[PDB]
């Protein structure tokens, strides 16, 4: 159906489905054991924050790769269940829709996984040549495949280079992985995300240490963001002023996982409804603190 | 009387095939995933079809798009799935199966849903005519004694030649089970099950459980790579080596694959030295595969 234009949210990355087993102990190899409880969850980065953005109140879009089959299946109507778009889904010809096995061991808290296969392409610059931007009011990237992302954060470049400046498209990108190739993803974006995982890799050991050593990465007018568990979020803007805000503990944490996609999602929200960044890092850090007390995404709001 | 009918779970396998077993807490890739229809009276029938005899499923499903995934897998199979038991408690039972493609190994984590067991109840409520051969895989046991017992009686009023030859599973070394030994014209009792109980090898194992057996029967104990070993009426040790495909590299579903083919060969009337050896050889073809699809 019809999107007005400069409505949506578009987030670009990875959708697996997470097969997640609670155990009393590890399994020995070569056994059959019954396990306490299962759930089968939609996951991936750039899939969560979707549903965040769509808890929030966004119009929103996701992109990335599928595969025709009863997992793409079971992973749409989760989508469509969270009120996504999916319209913009790459199906491809070729490999699996990603499926991970996690195991959770009971009595001590131990979280074992068999990661996705790497079968299925990624989304790639000519697939998303494919795509009519009009409809998006912000594109923001998960940090996969760079070389081809980088042509896509060119494309919007273009785009962008003539239109008002009120009917320009915001772009985000996020760096989540340790892994080389992703580090040029930061010279593109308005805002980008780093994370402390990735930052501790690069030997920095807290967040100012990683805004302050970092920002020298990203492009002129960008705003480099990065959030510490329960020390809080930072940000630091071209005007050099390092933002800060502490976190926001919940009566008791429940579920973590998801976090960092919820403080994601929330930050380019607030930006997005036109707060200010120390207005968003906060907003950020609310939601996150509220999600890692809850089970999931349902209580949110 | 044409058909063989198994009666069992099936169980939706969701399959990482990783080339060594993740230890506590670490964080591995798998090579490859899909999804099969499971459960051993389910993979009994995938193995009898693919052997071209016709067979029939038996047991509980929940509808859903777990249930139609199954279905649909069942008949591109040709199994007659007109015997099943639905509900409407529950949902499809499911398993994460790790494949050790370095050794086969597989490691099944099932979820079993509260989903209803198939009872003497709706047993009682089949047409017995089509069965040349009945196999049941032990579950729930002092509720199938009783669906035995109604194939017992029905062997009385045909000739000694239009009886209903039955086959039992004992894989779980679960008490309430070890009651169906006495029952059935063939028992298969697994290693595991053989083990937990003081047996130190299928040759032991046989010589100790066929005490336990009716009157006639054949006691079958595969053992995997030494082989399987098989106890009749005559007293008489019979032995089979094992079929060792050149890489193990999947053996998820050989002792379903096992019991299959044994029975297929008695069906038709082959030896049970014939039977043991042939299922030794189909068993060993399917553990140098990934899934069923090959092993003819
Ligand atoms: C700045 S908000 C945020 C952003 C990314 C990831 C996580 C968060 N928020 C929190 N993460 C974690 N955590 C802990 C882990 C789970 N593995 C690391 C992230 N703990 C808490 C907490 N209390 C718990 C602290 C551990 C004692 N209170 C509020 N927010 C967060
Ligand atoms: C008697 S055939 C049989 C019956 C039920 C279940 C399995 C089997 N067959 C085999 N099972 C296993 N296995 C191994 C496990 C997985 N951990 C136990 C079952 N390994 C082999 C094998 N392995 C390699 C050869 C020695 C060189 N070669 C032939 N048949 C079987």
């Known amino acids: 159906g019809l999107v007005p234009r400069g409505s949506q949210i578009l987030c670009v990355g990875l959708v697996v489905l997470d097969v997640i087993s609670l155990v009393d102990k590890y399994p020995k190899e070569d056994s059959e054991i019954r396990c306490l409880s299962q759930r089968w969850q939609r996951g991936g980065n750039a899939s969560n924050s979707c549903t965040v953005l769509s808890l929030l109140g966004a119009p929103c879009a996701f992109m990335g790769s599928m595969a025709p089959g009863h997992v793409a299946d079971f992973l749409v109507a989760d989508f469509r269940r969270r009120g996504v778009d ?22 001590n808290g131990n979280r074992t996984i068999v990661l996705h296969d790497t079968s299925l392409p990624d989304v790639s610059a000519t697939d998303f040549e494919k795509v009519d931007l009009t409809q998006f009011k912000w594109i923001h990237i998960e940090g996969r495949n760079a070389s081809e992302q980088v042509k896509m954060l060119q494309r919007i470049d273009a785009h962008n280079t003539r239109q008002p400046p009120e009917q320009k498209i915001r772009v985000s990108v996020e760096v ?32 100012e240490e990683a805004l302050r050593g970092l920002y020298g990465r990203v492009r002129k007018g960008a705003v480099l963001v990065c959030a510490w568990a329960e020390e809080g979020a930072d940000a630091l803007g071209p005007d050099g002023k390092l933002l800060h805000s502490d976190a926001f503990p919940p009566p008791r944490v429940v579920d973590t996982l998801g976090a960092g996609d919820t403080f994601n999602a929330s930050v380019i929200f607030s930006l997005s409804q036109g707060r200010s960044v120390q207005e968003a890092l906060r907003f950020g850090c609310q939601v996150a603190g509220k999600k890692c007390g809850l089970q999931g995404f349902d209580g949110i709001v």
């Not at 999916?86 to 009595?107: E, L, M, Y």
């Not at 308005?190 to 030997?203: E, P, R, T």
């Open 86 to 107: 999916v319209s913009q889904v790459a199906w491809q010809s070729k490999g699996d829709t990603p499926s991970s096995c996690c195991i959770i061991n009971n009595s």
């Open 176 to 207: 989540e992985k340790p892994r080389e190739e992703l580090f040029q993803l930061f010279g593109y974006g308005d805002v980008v995300f780093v994370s402390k995982d990735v930052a501790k890799h690069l030997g920095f050991q807290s967040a």
